[PDB]
Amino acid sequence: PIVQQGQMVHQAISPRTLNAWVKVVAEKAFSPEVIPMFSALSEGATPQDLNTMLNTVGGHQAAMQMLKETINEEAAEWDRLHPVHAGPIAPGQMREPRGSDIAGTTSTLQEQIGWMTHNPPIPVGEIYKRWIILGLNKIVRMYSPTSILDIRQGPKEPFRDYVDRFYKTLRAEQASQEVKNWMTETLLVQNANPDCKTILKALGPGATLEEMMTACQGV
Amino acid sequence: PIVQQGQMVHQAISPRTLNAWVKVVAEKAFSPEVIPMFSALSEGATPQDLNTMLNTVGGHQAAMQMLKETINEEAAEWDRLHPVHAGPIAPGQMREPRGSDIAGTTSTLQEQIGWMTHNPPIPVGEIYKRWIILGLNKIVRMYSPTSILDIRQGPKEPFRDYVDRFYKTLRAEQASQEVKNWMTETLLVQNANPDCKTILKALGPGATLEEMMTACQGV
Amino acid sequence: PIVQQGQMVHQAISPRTLNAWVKVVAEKAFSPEVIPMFSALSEGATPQDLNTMLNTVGGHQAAMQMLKETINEEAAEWDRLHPVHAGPIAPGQMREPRGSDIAGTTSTLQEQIGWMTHNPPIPVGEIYKRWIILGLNKIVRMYSPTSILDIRQGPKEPFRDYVDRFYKTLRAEQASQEVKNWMTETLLVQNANPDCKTILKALGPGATLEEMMTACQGV
Amino acid sequence: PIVQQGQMVHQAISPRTLNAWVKVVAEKAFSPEVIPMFSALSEGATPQDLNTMLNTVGGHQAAMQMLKETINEEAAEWDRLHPVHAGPIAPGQMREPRGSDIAGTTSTLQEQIGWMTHNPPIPVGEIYKRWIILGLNKIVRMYSPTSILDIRQGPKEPFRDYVDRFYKTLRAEQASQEVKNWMTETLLVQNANPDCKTILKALGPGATLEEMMTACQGV
Amino acid sequence: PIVQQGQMVHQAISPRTLNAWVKVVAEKAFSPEVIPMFSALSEGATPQDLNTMLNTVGGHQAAMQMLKETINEEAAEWDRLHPVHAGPIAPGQMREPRGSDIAGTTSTLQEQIGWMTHNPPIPVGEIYKRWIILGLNKIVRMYSPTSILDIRQGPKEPFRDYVDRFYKTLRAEQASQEVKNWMTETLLVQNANPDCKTILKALGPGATLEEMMTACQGV
Amino acid sequence: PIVQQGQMVHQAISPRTLNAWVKVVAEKAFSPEVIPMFSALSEGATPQDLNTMLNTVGGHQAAMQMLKETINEEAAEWDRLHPVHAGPIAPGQMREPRGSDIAGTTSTLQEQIGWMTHNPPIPVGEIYKRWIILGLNKIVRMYSPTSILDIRQGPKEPFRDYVDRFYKTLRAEQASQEVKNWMTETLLVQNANPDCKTILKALGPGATLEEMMTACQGV
Ligand SMILES: [Cl-]
Ligand SMILES: [Cl-]
Ligand SMILES: [Cl-]
Ligand SMILES: [Cl-]
Ligand SMILES: [Cl-]
Ligand SMILES: [Cl-]
Ligand SMILES: [Cl-]
Ligand SMILES: [Cl-]
Ligand SMILES: [Cl-]
Ligand SMILES: [Cl-]
Ligand SMILES: [Cl-]
Ligand SMILES: [Cl-]
Ligand SMILES: [Cl-]
Ligand SMILES: [Cl-]
Ligand SMILES: [Cl-]
Ligand SMILES: [Cl-]
Ligand SMILES: [Cl-]
Ligand SMILES: [Cl-]
Ligand SMILES: [Cl-]
Ligand SMILES: [Cl-]
Ligand SMILES: [Cl-]
Ligand SMILES: [Cl-]
Ligand SMILES: [Cl-]
Ligand SMILES: [Cl-]
Ligand SMILES: [Cl-]
Ligand SMILES: [Cl-]
Ligand SMILES: [Cl-]
Ligand SMILES: [Cl-]
Ligand SMILES: [Cl-]
Ligand SMILES: [Cl-]
Ligand SMILES: [Cl-]
Ligand SMILES: [Cl-]
Ligand SMILES: [Cl-]
Ligand SMILES: [Cl-]
Ligand SMILES: [Cl-]
Ligand SMILES: [Cl-]
């Protein structure tokens, strides 16, 4: 990656960053929290470091292939929006990146460093990471085994566990924020057990989650 | 985070900081000592690092949602107290942060660095951490299974263990310091077993905890 | 290795880089993901560091000997393409590297540093790593126990597992990218079980992997 | 903490310093060797780092409360010896610390850094650590289960084990150095078993511990 | 060791370098791969660091004594080839090292640093490491339990395992490279089982190891 | 410790140096290899760091007390050889250290840094470490359970194991180097089993250990 005196300098990906990413992939598969962890382990990463993290994953090659196809889609869109201009690269300049250059497959490390350190900067690492996180979200949604409509509180289930399952599945839903606002507004109280449901209905339409869980505590 | 020559510089969150936070969350849930540990693992953290630490938590999504609602409350209050002034941002200045900018959801990393390194500084990281610690305290209080009024010394319980339970629950109470002074002043001696209670009454109203535990040692 | 102020400086290979490489070799043998991991653990490595990583491998001496022979082939080709010019090395210059100099067996550490830090640079470390990765690919292909033509979906096998095996073996194939495009275009749908095969045929010749796996999900 | 070019600079407490302190507290309770370890893990620590180390301790809240009371005693004494002078803080100066400022509860991190880096320095971190180590010594003495007068050599106990127990308990005694000189001068030879006691009496009043243990070796 | 701005600076040997060397010695005894690992863990090491690594080895004191005798032989030879010149050391110079000075037993750390940082340099660390690696090779050869003449393929043994044993023992042989070329040229095909031996004879005298192992794959 | 631009700077003792020293003390007691490890973990250490390493040792308080007495002996001798001169310390100078100042009990950290960084330097850390290593050698010799005169080869014992035990005990002897030369010259061949003893007698008085162990290999 590249780390900030003021100047930005490049260093290799660390052994325990590699081992941490491999470990979390091997242990957690494609649970939603893997996406921030990835984004955490790839701060300021070049496309070479991102390809390094993706390639060190053994197994799950169906999901990794889907990730390849998503990356290729975003690269093709970048090529459509950024048409290349023919002409020799002048002294004191650098060529404009293509879709495959941001993906790190047709660009050297020195070119990526040059794009990322220029003023103004061309952040190929954050663009590539954006595409990767897009594909990862597609995979997390695709591998989720539950739907938010099926989360229903059991007759003896404590309210805290029901809310845990509900917002876990809701985190795996990854629909828009307004759709999630509606899901929280309707399904959570709607799909509670009769007692807790009655009490939550008695709370009112503008109750917070803290008040809702406090109301059904001893229940 | 940002680390201090004199100049403050930015670096990525470390792999063992991430793994340490994930580990302590997975092992200790929401015991009070998790709050300082968090504050320890996020020294000089940007809002991006704080969101990184919060998002890498799998499970406990009810508590994390309550934390989201608390953060949104504090952000709305910040917006109420700091009304934004319309006008183009002049060369040599930066826009004033909104509530969602301090929360890191509507501000880039460069903007957070700029606010945090300016003279005078706008410490968005410590404000956001303040809100987060507020919500975490709400969660710790909400998930505490015991009340300080129910802590009573057993007939054969050593005094040290009773004081341990008492001040553990008292730490989970998180009422004001004067209320805790009164709780220590009344309940501790009041709820001891008859023998130790008699001896502590014989000590006097101004005895220290060291003297109280010394008095009921062999007892 | 050599790490980037701007100037490139040299430091020793780290203990946990060594232990990480030894560990991944001992645990994963010659699975394809070992090649990027290697390339990850040897960023900016000198030929001395690469020889260090190769020599610390105990066992697998057949594969390591094959790697030696591949390295010698690439070195002989480098000598054929780069004939050495006789003459004394002038003050302010350095000799041009031979095949064995890039392989680190006839060149000192100071010579490798000098080649790698000169302007223009002679990247002996990346050339040697290129040869090493070539031989490693030969070994990975040679030790693969399965062929892509034998990957067939079971009558009760979920489609995701079948695609996992398919693209794992395909990753071990390491034929050209167009040949792999044809393999994906023909064998994947061709070798599915009758039900999923019928549905995929109904999808159309231009369906993505995401659409194909979505179609055979409940199936 | 603050680490030494010449200038003293501040950095956050490290994850493995935190985990090391938490681990040693969880494993060793309040054995005497915990006090140097603490002092080792808090070299150059600010009051914020010391409060961080104390607050991350879960359980043992009786001892931690006693530590709070000791710290408050030392702070009150500091306030008695250092009366505050009223007046506005002049440009180029900083206010003088109170007892609670050294304890880190009423002083910001910037104020602690300013006191610790000024010439002449006001070492609030070493003063606070001094108070903390005082309270920790009180706790170690209070939780010691044995008294030095009860350490007596068994009829078949090797002399080395007896001396081990003796100086362990003596380390837990923490009386003045002259009192410990007398304890070593009298009890050690006095409380040995009859044979070893006779031989040590035959050694003479000025024998070293090496000579004493050599004399009762084969015995 | 000493690590490279440009200037070479000295630092202490790291705890995990020590623990790594102790661990690999305790686990792998004197397998050939211990020699590169050693050379890896002692890059740029002073004679003091090398003596540190050798002295921390508990047990195997026969091999360590043999290593002492080899080091003394090489030191005596260095003294024979480099006779010392009598005379006072002039201001701006340093004495020439003896055999025991390179071995670190009669030279201080400052003298070793001075020799290693001078221009032109006297690399006492690499000379001492050269002697140490010589003795280590003698020990590895002496503790090898097998001879290359006894490696014979079993009637049901896969060819890959036979080549593994063959080149393992060959690595333990450590004869000259031409002798090893002859051993590979004769014994490998000569000592294979009848079927594989017939096929390898049918391959021809100029076949690579890759072709030889490919020929006897299904066999 | 203090680490070398050129200038020597001070930093705190590291958590894994502490944990490494505590671990090796807990696992290996007082085997000879603990002394170099100690000397390895305390390179450039101040007297405060050395006292830190000694004080963190729990248990073995008999040996630690003997170490205290040895340190006090060496300090008293230093005071006898270096009489203190009365007079005020002039501006631009520092007081000369006493025995207890080198031991770190009557000198602050700043005084130790000042002595260690002055030109010419007063290396109080290496003097204190010298005394500590002296006492540690006394303890290692005192706790050795075997004498070199009792090491005798068994009738079926391989020669390598016998030499291992012999030089282990010899390392624990710690007599002068000429006495050890005589012990190797006489006892090793003298105390071998009859067969190996006959063969070694047939070797001659000037045989190396390599030749001696080679002679009794198959025997
Ligand atoms: Cl995996
Ligand atoms: Cl370009
Ligand atoms: Cl662009
Ligand atoms: Cl963009
Ligand atoms: Cl509940
Ligand atoms: Cl569920
Ligand atoms: Cl969790
Ligand atoms: Cl702005
Ligand atoms: Cl503001
Ligand atoms: Cl503010
Ligand atoms: Cl008690
Ligand atoms: Cl309780
Ligand atoms: Cl292996
Ligand atoms: Cl040259
Ligand atoms: Cl060239
Ligand atoms: Cl090239
Ligand atoms: Cl499926
Ligand atoms: Cl398969
Ligand atoms: Cl604890
Ligand atoms: Cl002030
Ligand atoms: Cl003051
Ligand atoms: Cl003071
Ligand atoms: Cl004894
Ligand atoms: Cl006891
Ligand atoms: Cl060992
Ligand atoms: Cl000299
Ligand atoms: Cl020389
Ligand atoms: Cl030389
Ligand atoms: Cl085979
Ligand atoms: Cl074998
Ligand atoms: Cl111990
Ligand atoms: Cl002074
Ligand atoms: Cl002196
Ligand atoms: Cl001296
Ligand atoms: Cl033997
Ligand atoms: Cl023995």
Side-chain angles (χ1 to χ4, degrees), chain A residues 4 16-17 164 171 209-210 214, chain B residues 10 15-16 55 57 62 69 142:
Chain A
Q4 178 179 44
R16 65 192 316 175
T17 300
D164 279 334
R171 190 182 191 182
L209 182 62
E210 180 185 22
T214 302
Chain B
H10 167 264
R16 65 192 316 175
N55 290 332
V57 175
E69 294 184 4
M142 194 170 184

mmCIF file with all atom_site columns, all heavy atoms in Angstrom, chain A residues 4 16-17 164 171 209-210 214, chain B residues 10 15-16 55 57 62 69 142:
data_model
loop_
_atom_site.group_PDB
_atom_site.id
_atom_site.type_symbol
_atom_site.label_atom_id
_atom_site.label_alt_id
_atom_site.label_comp_id
_atom_site.label_asym_id
_atom_site.label_entity_id
_atom_site.label_seq_id
_atom_site.pdbx_PDB_ins_code
_atom_site.Cartn_x
_atom_site.Cartn_y
_atom_site.Cartn_z
_atom_site.occupancy
_atom_site.B_iso_or_equiv
_atom_site.pdbx_formal_charge
_atom_site.auth_seq_id
_atom_site.auth_comp_id
_atom_site.auth_asym_id
_atom_site.auth_atom_id
_atom_site.pdbx_PDB_model_num
ATOM 1   N N   . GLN A 1 4   ? 1.058   7.840   4.153  1.00 0.00 ? 4   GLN A N   1
ATOM 2   C CA  . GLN A 1 4   ? 1.560   9.190   4.393  1.00 0.00 ? 4   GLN A CA  1
ATOM 3   C C   . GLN A 1 4   ? 2.592   9.176   5.516  1.00 0.00 ? 4   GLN A C   1
ATOM 4   O O   . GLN A 1 4   ? 2.245   9.025   6.688  1.00 0.00 ? 4   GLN A O   1
ATOM 5   C CB  . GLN A 1 4   ? 0.416   10.148  4.746  1.00 0.00 ? 4   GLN A CB  1
ATOM 6   C CG  . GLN A 1 4   ? 0.872   11.571  5.067  1.00 0.00 ? 4   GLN A CG  1
ATOM 7   C CD  . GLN A 1 4   ? -0.285  12.501  5.397  1.00 0.00 ? 4   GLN A CD  1
ATOM 8   O OE1 . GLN A 1 4   ? -1.200  12.137  6.138  1.00 0.00 ? 4   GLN A OE1 1
ATOM 9   N NE2 . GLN A 1 4   ? -0.250  13.710  4.843  1.00 0.00 ? 4   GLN A NE2 1
ATOM 10  N N   . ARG A 1 16  ? 1.155   -10.324 8.055  1.00 0.00 ? 16  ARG A N   1
ATOM 11  C CA  . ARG A 1 16  ? -0.024  -10.527 8.889  1.00 0.00 ? 16  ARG A CA  1
ATOM 12  C C   . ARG A 1 16  ? -1.274  -9.856  8.331  1.00 0.00 ? 16  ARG A C   1
ATOM 13  O O   . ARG A 1 16  ? -2.382  -10.191 8.766  1.00 0.00 ? 16  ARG A O   1
ATOM 14  C CB  . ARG A 1 16  ? 0.243   -10.045 10.322 1.00 0.00 ? 16  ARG A CB  1
ATOM 15  C CG  . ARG A 1 16  ? 0.484   -8.550  10.488 1.00 0.00 ? 16  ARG A CG  1
ATOM 16  C CD  . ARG A 1 16  ? 1.020   -8.257  11.886 1.00 0.00 ? 16  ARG A CD  1
ATOM 17  N NE  . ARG A 1 16  ? 0.291   -9.007  12.906 1.00 0.00 ? 16  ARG A NE  1
ATOM 18  C CZ  . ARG A 1 16  ? 0.601   -9.023  14.199 1.00 0.00 ? 16  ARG A CZ  1
ATOM 19  N NH1 . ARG A 1 16  ? 1.635   -8.325  14.651 1.00 0.00 ? 16  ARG A NH1 1
ATOM 20  N NH2 . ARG A 1 16  ? -0.126  -9.743  15.042 1.00 0.00 ? 16  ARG A NH2 1
ATOM 21  N N   . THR A 1 17  ? -1.127  -8.929  7.381  1.00 0.00 ? 17  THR A N   1
ATOM 22  C CA  . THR A 1 17  ? -2.284  -8.495  6.601  1.00 0.00 ? 17  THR A CA  1
ATOM 23  C C   . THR A 1 17  ? -2.751  -9.614  5.681  1.00 0.00 ? 17  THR A C   1
ATOM 24  O O   . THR A 1 17  ? -3.947  -9.929  5.618  1.00 0.00 ? 17  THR A O   1
ATOM 25  C CB  . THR A 1 17  ? -1.941  -7.244  5.789  1.00 0.00 ? 17  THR A CB  1
ATOM 26  O OG1 . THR A 1 17  ? -1.565  -6.180  6.672  1.00 0.00 ? 17  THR A OG1 1
ATOM 27  C CG2 . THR A 1 17  ? -3.134  -6.808  4.956  1.00 0.00 ? 17  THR A CG2 1
ATOM 28  N N   . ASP A 1 164 ? -31.716 -9.460  17.132 1.00 0.00 ? 164 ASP A N   1
ATOM 29  C CA  . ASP A 1 164 ? -30.410 -9.834  16.592 1.00 0.00 ? 164 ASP A CA  1
ATOM 30  C C   . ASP A 1 164 ? -30.551 -10.527 15.241 1.00 0.00 ? 164 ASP A C   1
ATOM 31  O O   . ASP A 1 164 ? -29.915 -10.129 14.257 1.00 0.00 ? 164 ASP A O   1
ATOM 32  C CB  . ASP A 1 164 ? -29.664 -10.732 17.581 1.00 0.00 ? 164 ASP A CB  1
ATOM 33  C CG  . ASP A 1 164 ? -28.991 -9.949  18.696 1.00 0.00 ? 164 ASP A CG  1
ATOM 34  O OD1 . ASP A 1 164 ? -28.662 -8.763  18.483 1.00 0.00 ? 164 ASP A OD1 1
ATOM 35  O OD2 . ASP A 1 164 ? -28.780 -10.525 19.784 1.00 0.00 ? 164 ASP A OD2 1
ATOM 36  N N   . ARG A 1 171 ? -29.058 -6.749  7.553  1.00 0.00 ? 171 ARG A N   1
ATOM 37  C CA  . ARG A 1 171 ? -27.735 -6.389  7.058  1.00 0.00 ? 171 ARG A CA  1
ATOM 38  C C   . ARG A 1 171 ? -27.372 -7.195  5.819  1.00 0.00 ? 171 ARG A C   1
ATOM 39  O O   . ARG A 1 171 ? -26.704 -6.680  4.917  1.00 0.00 ? 171 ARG A O   1
ATOM 40  C CB  . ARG A 1 171 ? -26.682 -6.592  8.148  1.00 0.00 ? 171 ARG A CB  1
ATOM 41  C CG  . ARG A 1 171 ? -25.321 -6.007  7.795  1.00 0.00 ? 171 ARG A CG  1
ATOM 42  C CD  . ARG A 1 171 ? -24.300 -6.277  8.883  1.00 0.00 ? 171 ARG A CD  1
ATOM 43  N NE  . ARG A 1 171 ? -23.073 -5.511  8.676  1.00 0.00 ? 171 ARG A NE  1
ATOM 44  C CZ  . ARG A 1 171 ? -22.003 -5.592  9.459  1.00 0.00 ? 171 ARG A CZ  1
ATOM 45  N NH1 . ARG A 1 171 ? -22.006 -6.409  10.503 1.00 0.00 ? 171 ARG A NH1 1
ATOM 46  N NH2 . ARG A 1 171 ? -20.930 -4.857  9.199  1.00 0.00 ? 171 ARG A NH2 1
ATOM 47  N N   . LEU A 1 209 ? -35.551 1.846   19.123 1.00 0.00 ? 209 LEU A N   1
ATOM 48  C CA  . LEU A 1 209 ? -35.230 0.448   19.389 1.00 0.00 ? 209 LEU A CA  1
ATOM 49  C C   . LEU A 1 209 ? -34.906 0.224   20.860 1.00 0.00 ? 209 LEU A C   1
ATOM 50  O O   . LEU A 1 209 ? -35.232 -0.834  21.410 1.00 0.00 ? 209 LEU A O   1
ATOM 51  C CB  . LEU A 1 209 ? -34.063 -0.011  18.513 1.00 0.00 ? 209 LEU A CB  1
ATOM 52  C CG  . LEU A 1 209 ? -33.663 -1.483  18.665 1.00 0.00 ? 209 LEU A CG  1
ATOM 53  C CD1 . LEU A 1 209 ? -34.814 -2.396  18.270 1.00 0.00 ? 209 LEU A CD1 1
ATOM 54  C CD2 . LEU A 1 209 ? -32.413 -1.809  17.860 1.00 0.00 ? 209 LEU A CD2 1
ATOM 55  N N   . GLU A 1 210 ? -34.264 1.200   21.506 1.00 0.00 ? 210 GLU A N   1
ATOM 56  C CA  . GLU A 1 210 ? -33.978 1.086   22.933 1.00 0.00 ? 210 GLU A CA  1
ATOM 57  C C   . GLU A 1 210 ? -35.264 0.977   23.741 1.00 0.00 ? 210 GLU A C   1
ATOM 58  O O   . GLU A 1 210 ? -35.366 0.148   24.653 1.00 0.00 ? 210 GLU A O   1
ATOM 59  C CB  . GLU A 1 210 ? -33.152 2.288   23.394 1.00 0.00 ? 210 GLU A CB  1
ATOM 60  C CG  . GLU A 1 210 ? -32.782 2.275   24.870 1.00 0.00 ? 210 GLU A CG  1
ATOM 61  C CD  . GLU A 1 210 ? -32.062 3.543   25.298 1.00 0.00 ? 210 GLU A CD  1
ATOM 62  O OE1 . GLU A 1 210 ? -32.217 4.576   24.611 1.00 0.00 ? 210 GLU A OE1 1
ATOM 63  O OE2 . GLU A 1 210 ? -31.339 3.507   26.315 1.00 0.00 ? 210 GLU A OE2 1
ATOM 64  N N   . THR A 1 214 ? -36.554 -2.287  25.716 1.00 0.00 ? 214 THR A N   1
ATOM 65  C CA  . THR A 1 214 ? -36.844 -2.106  27.135 1.00 0.00 ? 214 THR A CA  1
ATOM 66  C C   . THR A 1 214 ? -38.263 -2.549  27.470 1.00 0.00 ? 214 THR A C   1
ATOM 67  O O   . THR A 1 214 ? -38.500 -3.112  28.546 1.00 0.00 ? 214 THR A O   1
ATOM 68  C CB  . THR A 1 214 ? -36.640 -0.642  27.538 1.00 0.00 ? 214 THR A CB  1
ATOM 69  O OG1 . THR A 1 214 ? -35.298 -0.242  27.238 1.00 0.00 ? 214 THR A OG1 1
ATOM 70  C CG2 . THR A 1 214 ? -36.891 -0.452  29.027 1.00 0.00 ? 214 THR A CG2 1
ATOM 71  N N   . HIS B 1 10  ? -1.067  10.544  9.056  1.00 0.00 ? 10  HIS B N   1
ATOM 72  C CA  . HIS B 1 10  ? -2.115  9.535   9.018  1.00 0.00 ? 10  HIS B CA  1
ATOM 73  C C   . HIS B 1 10  ? -1.566  8.202   8.526  1.00 0.00 ? 10  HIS B C   1
ATOM 74  O O   . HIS B 1 10  ? -0.730  8.158   7.618  1.00 0.00 ? 10  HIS B O   1
ATOM 75  C CB  . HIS B 1 10  ? -3.270  9.992   8.122  1.00 0.00 ? 10  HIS B CB  1
ATOM 76  C CG  . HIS B 1 10  ? -4.244  8.908   7.785  1.00 0.00 ? 10  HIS B CG  1
ATOM 77  N ND1 . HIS B 1 10  ? -4.176  8.188   6.612  1.00 0.00 ? 10  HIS B ND1 1
ATOM 78  C CD2 . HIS B 1 10  ? -5.312  8.424   8.462  1.00 0.00 ? 10  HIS B CD2 1
ATOM 79  C CE1 . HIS B 1 10  ? -5.158  7.305   6.581  1.00 0.00 ? 10  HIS B CE1 1
ATOM 80  N NE2 . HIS B 1 10  ? -5.862  7.427   7.692  1.00 0.00 ? 10  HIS B NE2 1
ATOM 81  N N   . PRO B 1 15  ? -3.577  -4.429  11.518 1.00 0.00 ? 15  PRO B N   1
ATOM 82  C CA  . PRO B 1 15  ? -4.273  -5.726  11.548 1.00 0.00 ? 15  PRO B CA  1
ATOM 83  C C   . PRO B 1 15  ? -4.543  -6.253  12.948 1.00 0.00 ? 15  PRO B C   1
ATOM 84  O O   . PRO B 1 15  ? -5.618  -6.818  13.186 1.00 0.00 ? 15  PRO B O   1
ATOM 85  C CB  . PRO B 1 15  ? -3.322  -6.641  10.764 1.00 0.00 ? 15  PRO B CB  1
ATOM 86  C CG  . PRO B 1 15  ? -2.624  -5.716  9.823  1.00 0.00 ? 15  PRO B CG  1
ATOM 87  C CD  . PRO B 1 15  ? -2.425  -4.443  10.599 1.00 0.00 ? 15  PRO B CD  1
ATOM 88  N N   . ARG B 1 16  ? -3.607  -6.090  13.886 1.00 0.00 ? 16  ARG B N   1
ATOM 89  C CA  . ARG B 1 16  ? -3.812  -6.588  15.242 1.00 0.00 ? 16  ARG B CA  1
ATOM 90  C C   . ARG B 1 16  ? -4.641  -5.647  16.107 1.00 0.00 ? 16  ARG B C   1
ATOM 91  O O   . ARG B 1 16  ? -5.136  -6.072  17.158 1.00 0.00 ? 16  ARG B O   1
ATOM 92  C CB  . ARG B 1 16  ? -2.463  -6.880  15.917 1.00 0.00 ? 16  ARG B CB  1
ATOM 93  C CG  . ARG B 1 16  ? -1.568  -5.673  16.164 1.00 0.00 ? 16  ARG B CG  1
ATOM 94  C CD  . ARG B 1 16  ? -0.167  -6.131  16.558 1.00 0.00 ? 16  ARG B CD  1
ATOM 95  N NE  . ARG B 1 16  ? -0.214  -7.228  17.522 1.00 0.00 ? 16  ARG B NE  1
ATOM 96  C CZ  . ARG B 1 16  ? 0.850   -7.889  17.967 1.00 0.00 ? 16  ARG B CZ  1
ATOM 97  N NH1 . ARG B 1 16  ? 2.066   -7.571  17.542 1.00 0.00 ? 16  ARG B NH1 1
ATOM 98  N NH2 . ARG B 1 16  ? 0.695   -8.875  18.840 1.00 0.00 ? 16  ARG B NH2 1
ATOM 99  N N   . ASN B 1 55  ? -18.100 -1.584  12.195 1.00 0.00 ? 55  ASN B N   1
ATOM 100 C CA  . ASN B 1 55  ? -18.682 -2.399  11.134 1.00 0.00 ? 55  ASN B CA  1
ATOM 101 C C   . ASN B 1 55  ? -18.125 -3.818  11.126 1.00 0.00 ? 55  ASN B C   1
ATOM 102 O O   . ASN B 1 55  ? -18.817 -4.746  10.696 1.00 0.00 ? 55  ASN B O   1
ATOM 103 C CB  . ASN B 1 55  ? -18.458 -1.734  9.777  1.00 0.00 ? 55  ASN B CB  1
ATOM 104 C CG  . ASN B 1 55  ? -19.275 -0.466  9.608  1.00 0.00 ? 55  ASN B CG  1
ATOM 105 O OD1 . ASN B 1 55  ? -20.345 -0.321  10.201 1.00 0.00 ? 55  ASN B OD1 1
ATOM 106 N ND2 . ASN B 1 55  ? -18.773 0.460   8.799  1.00 0.00 ? 55  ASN B ND2 1
ATOM 107 N N   . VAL B 1 57  ? -17.848 -5.744  13.477 1.00 0.00 ? 57  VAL B N   1
ATOM 108 C CA  . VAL B 1 57  ? -18.506 -6.551  14.498 1.00 0.00 ? 57  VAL B CA  1
ATOM 109 C C   . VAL B 1 57  ? -19.620 -7.352  13.832 1.00 0.00 ? 57  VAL B C   1
ATOM 110 O O   . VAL B 1 57  ? -20.592 -6.787  13.327 1.00 0.00 ? 57  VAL B O   1
ATOM 111 C CB  . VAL B 1 57  ? -19.057 -5.682  15.633 1.00 0.00 ? 57  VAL B CB  1
ATOM 112 C CG1 . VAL B 1 57  ? -19.837 -6.534  16.625 1.00 0.00 ? 57  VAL B CG1 1
ATOM 113 C CG2 . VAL B 1 57  ? -17.926 -4.944  16.330 1.00 0.00 ? 57  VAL B CG2 1
ATOM 114 N N   . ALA B 1 62  ? -28.526 -5.971  17.227 1.00 0.00 ? 62  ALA B N   1
ATOM 115 C CA  . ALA B 1 62  ? -29.461 -5.142  17.981 1.00 0.00 ? 62  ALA B CA  1
ATOM 116 C C   . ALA B 1 62  ? -28.726 -4.008  18.683 1.00 0.00 ? 62  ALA B C   1
ATOM 117 O O   . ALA B 1 62  ? -29.119 -2.838  18.586 1.00 0.00 ? 62  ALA B O   1
ATOM 118 C CB  . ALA B 1 62  ? -30.225 -5.997  18.992 1.00 0.00 ? 62  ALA B CB  1
ATOM 119 N N   . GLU B 1 69  ? -28.675 4.468   16.250 1.00 0.00 ? 69  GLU B N   1
ATOM 120 C CA  . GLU B 1 69  ? -29.702 5.444   16.601 1.00 0.00 ? 69  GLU B CA  1
ATOM 121 C C   . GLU B 1 69  ? -29.161 6.508   17.549 1.00 0.00 ? 69  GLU B C   1
ATOM 122 O O   . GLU B 1 69  ? -29.491 7.693   17.413 1.00 0.00 ? 69  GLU B O   1
ATOM 123 C CB  . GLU B 1 69  ? -30.915 4.735   17.207 1.00 0.00 ? 69  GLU B CB  1
ATOM 124 C CG  . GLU B 1 69  ? -31.644 3.839   16.214 1.00 0.00 ? 69  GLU B CG  1
ATOM 125 C CD  . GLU B 1 69  ? -32.906 3.222   16.786 1.00 0.00 ? 69  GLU B CD  1
ATOM 126 O OE1 . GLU B 1 69  ? -33.264 3.546   17.939 1.00 0.00 ? 69  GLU B OE1 1
ATOM 127 O OE2 . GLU B 1 69  ? -33.541 2.412   16.078 1.00 0.00 ? 69  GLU B OE2 1
ATOM 128 N N   . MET B 1 142 ? -27.869 -1.361  29.535 1.00 0.00 ? 142 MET B N   1
ATOM 129 C CA  . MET B 1 142 ? -29.073 -2.094  29.158 1.00 0.00 ? 142 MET B CA  1
ATOM 130 C C   . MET B 1 142 ? -28.883 -3.604  29.257 1.00 0.00 ? 142 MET B C   1
ATOM 131 O O   . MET B 1 142 ? -29.842 -4.327  29.550 1.00 0.00 ? 142 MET B O   1
ATOM 132 C CB  . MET B 1 142 ? -29.498 -1.705  27.743 1.00 0.00 ? 142 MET B CB  1
ATOM 133 C CG  . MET B 1 142 ? -30.900 -2.144  27.384 1.00 0.00 ? 142 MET B CG  1
ATOM 134 S SD  . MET B 1 142 ? -31.458 -1.426  25.833 1.00 0.00 ? 142 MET B SD  1
ATOM 135 C CE  . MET B 1 142 ? -33.133 -2.037  25.784 1.00 0.00 ? 142 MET B CE  1
#
